[PDB]
Design a protein around this ligand. Structure first.
Ligand code: SF4
Ligand code: SF4
Ligand code: FES
Ligand SMILES: [Zn+2]
Lengths: 91, 84, 126, 96, 207, 48, 690, 114
C-alpha cells in the first residue's frame, strides 16, 4: 500500500536526483560519527539520515546513497533503515 | 635403446621405498642436470610397491622392482636403464 | 548330518538365472545417497544403496518415450552397512566400486559471534 | 492459429512438426494429423483485463469448488498486470 | 474414546505374552526372541531345526490347537546374511486365536517340510521354492507352481528385476512362441518418494 | 436437453463425430515435443 | 574431561564440547530438529522459531538453533510442549502462504510440506484473507516469487557472509516485511544459484529448470564438475534419458554445499552444437556424414604412413585421463611423444617430474589452517570460486590476512594490494617490502600461483622467483616441514592428469617441429592453427561440440561429455575423482578411449585393454595417484625442485601481469559447453547491459 | 568354512549325482524328440544337454551342485512328462536371438554396450 517498501525510479526520485550535504551538515556529521567508537561508524546512519531529511525535507534514493558513500556503508543497509523507521519520509 | 621416459613409483612413508627417497633427495638433482630433456617422473603413492618403469621407443615398457633396497642399488639400476 | 569343509568363496550366479552379460559386464555402485540440497532433511543419508551402471535410453519413434534394453535400470537395494552390500555383490558375482560415507564435520556455532567488537563475524543483517 | 509448414503438416500449439526429410510422416499418409485448432494462448489473450479497486485480489477461477485454488494477486505495479498462475486472467488496479 | 485412533485392549496383549512365555519355556531348544506387537499379534522366532517340533506341538498340544495353516510365506531381506524370513501363520479354532512362527534360511541353507504336519503346506512350499529359491526337505513333489515351465530365476527376490530378463513373442519363421531378451517401449519410471524427515521417532535407529 | 440445455462455450464442437476408426480422419499418435538435442551445423566453406 | 560436559536427550546421554547447541547434540544422538532458518554454514538467527524444544523442569521453550547447551540439561524433543509449539509455528507460516504447490517448482522437495506433514497439524483455522507481494526481478537465473517467502533470511546471510555482495535485505517491518532489494538490481554473482538451494520454499527458483520436471521423476547420478579444476561434487538429475539440471553434493573438503552458476547452468550446452555423427571431407573439401568404419580406416591409413615427430596430439581441458593415456600409448606405439596440452606449464627446471611443482599442496581445506595467503596472477573469484569462497570463510572466522600481486579486483573480500608487476616478488624475497613484516611474524603462510600467470612468456621466471620467495619464507618463519607454502591453482580440469601422465605441457614442440598428422582431442581454444602447420596436414578432431577445432578438421570422431561417460579427473590438489554415467552419448557418439582403441585395432597397432578396468590398471601403471579416488597423496620433494630451478637465467618482463577473467562478463563463457549455452549468453547480456 | 551339507558331504558324491542326471537326459532326448515332434536330430539334443551341463562346470561348492541337480531333475520331470511343449524345449536353442559378437570392435560399432 501507501507504504510500499519498494522503489521504482522516476524523474523526481532517481539516483541522479540532486542531493548533497551542506558544509555545516558535514561538520555535524563529523561530530555525530565522533559520538561512536572509531571502528563503528555505521551507527551514525539514523542521525545522518534524519539530518538529510531535515535539510531536504524528505528522503530520495540519492540521499540514502550519499549517506552510505559518506559513511562507507552498503546502500541497502540504509534502505532497510529508511523502510523500517517511520519518521523517515520517502515521499 | 630408444629410451623416452623414466617414471619412478614409490611410497612416502614405508621402509621398502626408503632407498628411493634417499636416492631422490641426494642424486635426482644431479641426474636431471646431466640429462635435462629426459622426463624422470616420480609419482609417490600410498601402500604401493616401488618400481621403476623405463619405456623405450615404440611403446615398450620395462619394470624392475626396488622393494627393500638401498640408494646405491637404485642408482645402479637407474644407470643400467640409462645405458642399456 | 554334521558339518562340511567348503573352504572357498561363495558363488550364487548359477542359481539366479542371471545371464552372463548382466554378471560379467555389470559394475555395481555401493554408496550412501547424498542429501538433496533443496531440503535440509538427513533421513535418506542413513542406509546404504546398491545401484547399477546406466545404459542406453532411446526415444521410441511412435510416441517419443524412453526405451531400454536394461532390466536392471531401476534396480535399487537397501543395506544397513557396507560389508553387507559388498557380500551381496561378491555373492551374486558382480563387480563393485565402493564409496565411503560422507558425514558433515561438527561445527562451532555461536549467536554472539554475530555481535562482536573487533572480529569480522559482526553481521549487518539482523 | 494453426499454421502449416513447408511440407503442409500443421504446427501444434507446442511448436511441433516433422521436418520435410523426416521419415516419421508415413503414419500420416492416407490418414490425418490430429491437432487442436483452439489454441488456449490466443484465447486467453482475447480476454480483457478485469479492473479492481483493491490492491490485493483473489482468483478461484469460477464456480468455487469447480475452479482452482484461491490465490491472491498483488497489483501495485501500475505498468504491469497481475496474472493468475492457474488461469491466465489479468487484473489491474483501477485507481492506480 | 478418541474417534480416529483405534481402541486398544491390553487383555489380549497379556494373554499372548503369557502364552509366549509358555512356548518359550516349553521349547527352549529352538525358541528365539518371542515378541508381541502394539496390535495384538504373537510372533515366535525359532531356529529352523525346530520347525517340525514347534509346529507339531502347536497343532497337537491341548492348550495350543493351531491346526489350520492359514499362510506360509517368505521375506527377502538382502542385508542380513540369511535373507529369507519364512513365516508360518496359524489359527486355533478352539481358542479363536492366531499365532505366527518365523525361521530364517539362505540360498544354500534349506529347511524341513511340514507336510507331515499340515498337508496345506505342499503348494505353499512349492511357491516359496519357485519364488525365492528356498529348498525344502522330504517334500513329496517339489517343482514349480506359478512360474513358466522353463523359467530361470526366483522373481520375488529383491535382486530380481520387476520386468524380468526375457520377453515372449511369436515368430512366423519358426512358427512358435519364442523368448527374447527384454526391450521396452516405455521404461518403468522409478520414483524416489521417501521423505527426508524422520516420521516415527519411536523406531529411530541409533548410530 | 430441449428443456435443460447445456451451457454455451466457444471451444465446444458444433458437429459431433462418430468413431472414425479404420478410416481417414482418424487418430494417429505422435510426439508433441520438439527436438531436445541439436546437432552441429557444419560450415559451407572449406578450410582453404 | 577435555572440557566436555554430560547432557541428555530423552535420557540418552552424550558428551558435547562447550558452546555446542541443543540442535547439534540432538543430532549427535541421531535426532534432527525441525528448521527453516538454520543452515549449518550461516550465522545463527532465531527467526522461524520452529526449532523450539522444552528443557526438563523449565517453563518455556528454547531455540535449539541458538541456545548453547548447559550441564545436566535434558532435552525433550517429542513432548507435548514441543509438538504444540511446532504446530503453532506451522499454523503461522501457512496462514499467509499461497496455495501454489502445484505450480511451485519446489513441490515434492519442499521442507514446508514435509515439516507440515511430520510436525504440524492437518487443518487450517485461518478464515481471513492472505497477503501478496509484487515479485522482484534479480536476473535471468533466479526467479523470485515472494508470496512464498517465509522470511528466513538465508538468502541475506548467504549473500553477505559467503558471496560478499550485501545487496539483499529486509524492506519494511511487521507482516509487510519484504525481503529483497529496495531497487531493481540484478543479483548476478558467481555463487548466486545456491540461494536457490537454501531457499526452502520455492520463492527463489531456477528459471531454466522452471516447470521442467518434479523431484520424484528425476534419477540422481553422482558425478563431478569439469568447468573448473576444483572438482566440485555434483548430482546430475535425469528424466527419461535427458539431463534436467545440475545439483550440488556435499564435500566438506571442496564444495561444502556450493557450486558456481557456470557449473549448474551451463548444462544447456550439452543440448546444443553437438557432434553426433562421424564426419569426413568430400572431394569438394566439405564436411559430410559417414560411418565409423570409413573414418577410422582413413585415420588408420594416415597413421600407418607416419612415424615419430610427424604425428602429434593436443588436449583441450574437458578431457579424461583414460583418453589421454590411450592416445599417449597409441602415439608412443607409433614413436611420437609430441603429446601436448593447450595450457602452458613451464618444464624449465623440474617441470612435471615432481607433482609438488604443479599441485595445490596446501589442499583447499588448508586455507582454514593458514594465517597469510598471497595471490599471484590470479582472480580466484572468476577462476576457481569455491577456493575464493574458502578464502573468504577464513578471512571471516580465522582473521586471515590476504595479499595479492596482480591487477586490482574485488574478490568479495578485502585484501592488501601490493603492486602489479612481478618484480614485487624479488622485493618480498630479499626482504625489503612492507609485507615482509607480516610474512616474518606469520606462522602458516601459503603462496598460490595461477596457471594464468604461466601462460605469458615469463611463466618460468615467475615460477622460479616464487620458488625463491617460498624457500626464504620457510627459512624465516620456521614452518613445521609438513606445511606446504608453494601452491599452483589451475583453471583447466584435464591439466593435472595430463601432467601426471607425462604430457609435455604447451604447444611449443608443435610449432618447433610441426607435424603432418595432428590429433585434436577436445581442443577448441585455438592455440594452434593451420596457418602454423604444413599444407595438407591431416587433422582428426575428437570432441562433443563443434566450436573451433571441428571446422578446421579433415575427420571428426564425435566423443562423449562428462555427463555421458565414466572418467577420472584430477583437481589442483591431486584428488582423483570419478564421473559416472547419467546419460549415454547422443547419436553415434562414443567414449573417447573406446574410439582410440578401435582406431588402434583398425590400424596394425592394438592396445591391450578392451575394457575400462584394464584402462585403469594402465593408469595405475603410469601413475597410481589416478586410481586412489577421493584421496590426496602427500608429496614432499620441493627442496630438490628448488635446488634445480635456481639455475635458469631468465628474468621477468616487468609487464603488469593481469588475469584474463577481470570481470564476470568474462566468466560465463570459457569452454565450449559454456559458449554453447543460451543461458550463459542471457547472463552476459544481463551483466554487460546492467 | 564349516556349513551344513544338503546331500553331498564332498564334490565326488555330487559328481555321482551329476552323472546319473546326465545318463537320464541322454536316455530321454530321443523319446521327447519323437513325442514332441521336434524338428531336430537326436545328436543336437545331446550336444545341447552337454553344453547346458558345461555351462556350470566351474562350480566347486557341493551345495550349488546339489541344487543344480535338483533343478535339472525338475526340468527332466517337466520334459519326461509333457507338461512343457516343444516351445519350451526349443527355447534352449535360441533360434532367433541374434548372436551378439565377442569382438570388441563389433560391439563398438553397434551401441555403447561393453
Ligand atoms: S527468499 Fe527464501 S531464503 Fe530468502 S528469507 Fe525468504 S524463504 Fe528465506
Ligand atoms: S514453498 Fe512448499 S508449501 Fe509453499 S507453495 Fe511451494 S511447495 Fe507449496
Ligand atoms: S531454526 Fe531456530 S528459529 Fe529457525
Ligand atoms: Zn485464476
Amino acid at each position: 500500500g501507501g507504504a510500499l517498501f519498494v522503489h521504482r525510479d522516476t524523474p523526481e526520485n532517481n539516483p541522479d536526483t540532486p542531493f548533497d550535504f551542506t558544509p555545516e551538515n558535514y561538520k555535524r556529521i563529523e561530530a555525530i560519527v565522533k559520538n561512536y567508537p572509531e571502528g563503528h561508524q555505521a551507527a551514525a546512519v539514523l542521525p545522518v539520515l534524519d539530518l538529510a531529511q531535515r535539510q531536504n525535507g524528505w528522503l530520495p534514493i540519492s540521499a540514502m546513497n550519499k549517506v552510505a558513500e559518506v559513511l562507507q556503508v552498503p546502500p541497502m543497509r540504509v534502505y532497510e533503515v529508511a523502510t523500517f523507521y517511520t519518521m523517515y519520509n520517502r515521499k | 635403446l630408444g629410451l623416452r621416459e623414466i617414471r619412478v613409483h614409490l611410497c612416502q612413508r614405508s621402509p621398502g621405498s626408503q632407498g628411493v627417497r634417499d636416492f631422490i633427495v641426494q642424486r635426482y638433482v644431479e641426474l636431471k642436470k646431466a640429462h635435462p630433456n629426459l622426463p624422470i617422473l616420480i609419482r609417490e603413492c600410498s601402500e604401493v610397491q616401488p618400481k621403476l618403469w623405463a619405456r623405450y621407443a615404440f611403446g615398450q615398457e620395462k619394470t624392475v622392482s626396488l622393494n627393500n633396497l638401498s640408494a646405491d642399488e637404485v642408482t645402479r639400476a637407474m644407470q643400467n636403464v640409462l645405458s642399456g | 548330518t554334521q558339518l562340511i569343509t567348503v573352504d572357498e568363496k561363495l558363488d550364487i550366479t548359477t542359481l539366479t538365472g542371471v545371464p552372463e552379460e548382466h554378471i560379467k559386464t555389470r559394475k555395481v555402485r555401493i554408496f550412501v545417497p547424498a542429501r538433496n540440497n533443496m531440503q535440509s532433511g538427513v533421513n535418506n543419508t542413513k542406509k546404504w544403496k546398491m545401484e547399477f551402471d546406466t545404459r542406453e535410453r532411446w526415444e521410441n519413434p511412435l510416441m517419443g518415450w524412453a526405451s531400454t534394453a536394461d532390466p536392471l535400470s531401476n534396480m535399487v537395494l537397501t543395506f544397513s552397512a557396507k560389508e553387507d552390500a559388498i557380500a551381496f555383490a561378491e555373492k551374486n558375482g558382480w563387480s563393485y566400486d565402493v564409496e565411503e560415507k560422507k558425514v558433515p564435520k561438527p561445527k562451532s556455532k555461536s549467536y554472539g559471534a554475530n555481535f562482536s567488537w573487533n572480529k569480522r563475524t559482526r553481521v549487518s543483517t539482523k | 492459429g494453426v499454421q502449416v509448414s513447408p511440407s503442409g503438416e500443421k504446427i501444434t500449439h507446442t511448436g511441433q512438426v516433422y521436418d520435410e526429410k523426416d521419415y516419421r510422416r508415413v503414419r500420416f499418409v492416407d490418414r490425418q494429423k490430429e491437432v487442436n485448432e483452439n489454441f488456449a494462448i490466443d484465447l486467453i489473450a482475447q480476454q480483457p483485463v478485469n479492473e479492481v479497486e483493491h490492491r490485493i485480489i483473489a482468483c478461484d477461477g469460477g464456480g468455487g469448488a469447480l475452479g482452482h485454488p484461491k490465490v491472491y494477486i498483488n497489483l501495485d505495479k501500475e505498468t504491469k498486470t497481475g496474472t493468475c498462475g492457474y488461469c491466465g486472467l489479468q487484473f489491474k488496479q483501477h485507481h492506480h | 474414546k478418541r474417534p480416529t485412533v483405534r481402541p486398544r485392549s491390553d487383555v489380549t496383549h497379556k494373554q499372548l505374552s503369557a502364552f509366549g512365555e509358555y512356548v518359550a519355556e516349553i521349547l527352549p531348544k529352538y525358541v528365539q526372541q518371542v515378541q508381541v506387537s502394539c496390535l495384538d499379534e504373537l510372533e515366535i522366532c525359532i531356529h529352523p531345526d525346530g520347525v517340525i517340533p514347534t509346529l507339531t506341538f502347536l497343532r497337537d498340544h491341548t492348550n495350543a490347537q493351531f491346526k489350520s495353516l492359514a499362510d506360509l510365506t517368505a521375506v527377502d531381506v538382502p542385508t542380513r546374511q540369511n535373507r529369507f524370513e519364512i513365516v508360518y501363520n496359524l489359527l486355533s479354532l478352539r481358542f479363536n486365536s492366531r499365532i505366527r512362527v518365523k525361521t530364517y534360511a539362505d540360498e544354500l541353507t534349506p529347511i524341513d517340510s511340514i507336510v507331515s504336519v499340515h498337508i496345506a503346506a505342499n503348494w505353499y512350499e512349492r511357491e516359496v521354492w519357485d519364488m525365492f529359491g528356498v529348498f525344502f526337505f522330504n517334500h513329496p513333489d517339489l517343482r514349480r507352481i506359478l512360474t513358466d515351465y522353463g523359467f530361470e530365476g526366483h522373481p520375488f527376490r529383491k535382486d530380481f528385476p520387476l520386468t524380468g530378463y526375457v520377453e515372449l513373442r511369436y515368430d512366423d519363421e519358426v512358427k512358435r512362441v519364442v523368448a527374447e531378451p527384454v526391450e521396452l517401449a516405455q521404461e518403468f519410471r522409478k520414483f524416489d518418494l521417501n521423505s527426508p524427515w524422520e516420521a516415527f521417532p519411536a523406531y529411530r535407529q541409533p548410530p | 436437453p430441449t428443456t435443460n440445455p447445456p451451457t454455451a462455450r466457444k471451444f465446444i464442437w458444433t458437429n459431433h463425430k462418430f468413431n472414425v476408426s479404420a478410416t481417414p480422419e482418424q487418430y494417429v499418435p505422435y510426439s508433441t515435443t520438439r527436438k531436445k538435442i541439436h546437432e552441429w551445423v557444419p560450415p559451407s566453406t572449406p578450410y582453404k | 574431561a577435555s572440557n566436555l560436559i554430560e547432557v541428555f536427550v530423552d535420557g540418552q546421554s552424550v558428551m558435547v564440547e562447550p558452546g555446542t547447541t541443543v540442535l547439534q547434540a540432538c543430532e549427535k544422538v541421531g535426532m534432527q530438529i525441525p528448521r527453516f532458518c538454520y543452515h549449518e554454514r550461516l550465522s545463527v538467527a532465531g527467526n522461524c522459531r520452529m526449532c523450539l524444544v522444552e528443557i526438563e523442569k523449565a517453563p518455556k521453550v528454547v531455540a535449539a538453533c541458538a541456545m548453547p547447551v548447559m550441564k545436566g540439561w535434558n532435552i525433550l524433543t517429542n513432548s507435548e510442549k514441543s509438538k504444540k509449539a511446532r504446530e503453532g509455528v506451522m499454523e503461522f507460516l501457512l496462514a499467509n502462504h499461497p496455495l501454489d504447490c502445484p505450480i511451485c517448482d519446489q513441490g515434492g522437495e519442499c521442507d514446508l510440506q514435509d515439516q507440515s506433514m511430520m510436525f504440524g497439524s492437518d487443518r487450517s483455522r485461518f478464515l481471513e484473507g492472505k497477503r501478496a507481494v509484487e515479485d522482484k526481478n534479480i536476473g535471468p537465473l533466479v526467479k523470485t516469487i515472494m508470496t512464498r517467502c517465509i522470511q528466513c533470511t538465508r538468502c541475506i546471510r548467504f549473500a553477505s557472509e559467503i558471496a560478499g555482495v550485501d545487496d539483499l535485505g529486509t524492506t519494511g517491518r511487521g507482516n509487510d516485511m519484504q525481503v529483497g532489494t529496495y531497487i531493481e538490481k540484478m543479483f548476478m554473482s558467481e555463487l548466486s544459484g545456491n540461494v536457490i538451494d537454501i531457499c526452502p520454499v520455492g520463492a527463489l527458483t531456477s528459471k531454466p529448470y522452471a516447470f521442467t520436471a518434479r523431484p520424484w521423476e528425476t534419477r540422481k547420478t553422482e558425478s563431478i564438475d569439469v568447468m573448473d579444476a576444483v572438482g566440485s561434487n555434483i548430482v546430475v538429475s535425469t528424466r527419461t534419458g535427458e539431463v534436467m539440471r545440475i545439483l550440488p553434493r556435499m564435500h566438506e573438503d571442496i564444495n561444502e554445499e556450493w557450486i558456481s552458476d557456470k557449473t549448474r547452468f551451463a548444462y544447456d550446452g550439452l543440448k546444443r552444437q553437438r557432434l553426433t555423427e562421424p564426419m569426413v571431407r568430400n572431394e569438394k573439401g566439405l564436411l559430410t556424414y559417414t560411418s565409423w568404419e570409413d573414418a577410422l580406416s582413413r585415420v588408420a591409413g594416415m597413421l600407418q604412413n607416419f612415424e615419430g615427430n610427424a604425428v602429434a596430439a593436443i588436449a583441450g581441458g574437458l578431457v579424461d585421463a583414460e583418453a589421454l593415456v590411450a592416445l599417449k600409448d597409441l602415439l608412443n606405439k607409433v614413436d611420437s611423444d609430441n603429446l601436448c596440452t593447450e595450457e602452458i606449464f613451464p618444464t624449465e627446471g623440474a617441470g612435471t617430474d615432481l607433482r609438488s611443482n604443479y599441485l595445490l599442496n596446501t589442499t583447499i581445506a588448508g586455507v582454514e589452517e593458514a594465517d597469510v595467503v598471497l595471490l599471484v596472477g590470479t582472480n580466484p573469484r572468476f577462476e576457481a570460486p569455491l577456493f575464493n569462497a574458502r578464502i573468504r570463510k577464513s578471512w571471516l572466522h580465522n582473521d586471515l590476512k590476504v595479499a595479492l600481486i596482480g591487477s586490482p579486483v574485488d574478490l568479495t573480500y578485502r585484501y592488501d594490494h601490493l603492486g602489479d608487476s612481478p618484480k614485487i616478488l624479488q622485493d618480498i624475497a630479499s626482504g625489503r617490502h612492507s609485507f615482509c613484516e607480516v610474512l616474518k611474524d606469520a606462522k602458516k603462510p601459503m603462496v598460490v600461483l595461477g596457471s594464468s600467470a604461466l601462460q605469458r612468456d615469463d611463466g618460468a621466471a615467475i615460477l622460479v622467483a616464487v620458488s625463491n620467495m617460498v624457500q626464504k619464507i620457510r627459512v624465516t618463519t620456521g614452518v613445521a616441514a609438513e606445511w606446504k607454502v608453494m601452491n599452483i591453482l589451475h583453471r583447466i580440469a584435464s591439466q593435472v592428469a595430463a601432467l601426471d601422465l607425462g604430457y609435455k605441457p604447451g604447444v611449443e614442440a608443435i610449432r618447433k617441429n610441426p607435424p603432418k598428422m595432428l590429433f585434436l582431442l577436445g581442443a577448441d581454444g585455438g592455440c594452434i592453427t593451420r596457418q602454423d602447420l604444413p599444407k595438407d596436414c591431416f587433422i582428426v578432431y575428437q570432441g562433443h561440440h563443434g566450436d573451433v577445432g571441428a571446422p578446421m578438421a579433415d575427420v571428426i570422431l564425435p566423443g562423449a561429455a562428462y555427463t555421458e561417460k565414466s572418467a577420472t579427473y584430477v583437481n589442483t590438489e591431486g584428488r582423483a575423482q570419478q564421473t559416472k554415467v547419467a546419460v549415454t552419448p547422443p547419436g553415434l557418439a562414443r567414449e573417447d578411449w573406446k574410439i582410440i582403441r578401435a582406431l588402434s585395432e583398425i590400424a596394425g597397432i592394438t592396445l591391450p585393454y578392451d575394457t575400462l578396468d584394464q584402462v585403469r590398471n594402465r593408469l595405475e601403471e603410469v601413475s597410481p595417484n589416478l586410481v586412489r579416488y577421493d584421496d590426496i597423496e602427500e608429496t614432499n620433494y620441493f627442496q630438490q625442485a628448488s635446488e634445480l630451478a635456481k639455475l635458469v637465467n631468465q628474468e621477468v618482463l616487468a609487464d603488469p601481469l593481469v588475469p584474463p577473467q577481470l570481470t564476470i562478463k568474462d566468466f560465463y563463457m570459457t569452454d565450449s559447453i559454456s559458449r554453447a549455452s543460451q543461458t550463459m549468453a542471457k547472463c552476459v547480456k544481463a551483466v554487460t547491459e546492467g | 568354512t564349516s556349513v551344513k551339507p544338503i546331500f553331498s558331504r564332498d564334490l565326488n558324491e555330487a559328481k555321482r549325482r551329476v552323472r546319473e542326471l546326465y545318463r537320464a537326459w541322454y536316455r530321454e532326448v530321443p523319446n521327447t524328440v519323437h513325442l514332441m515332434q521336434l524338428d531336430i536330430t537326436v545328436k543336437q539334443g545331446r550336444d545341447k544337454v552337454r553344453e547346458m551341463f558345461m555351462k556350470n562346470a566351474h562350480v566347486t561348492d557341493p551345495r550349488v551342485v546339489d541344487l543344480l541337480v535338483i533343478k535339472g531333475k525338475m526340468e527332466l520331470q517337466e520334459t519326461i512328462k509333457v507338461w512343457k511343449q516343444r516351445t519350451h524345449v526349443m527355447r534352449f536353442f535360441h533360434e532367433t536371438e541374434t548372436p551378439r559378437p565377442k569382438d570388441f570392435l563389433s560391439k563398438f560399432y553397434m551401441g555403447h554396450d561393453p
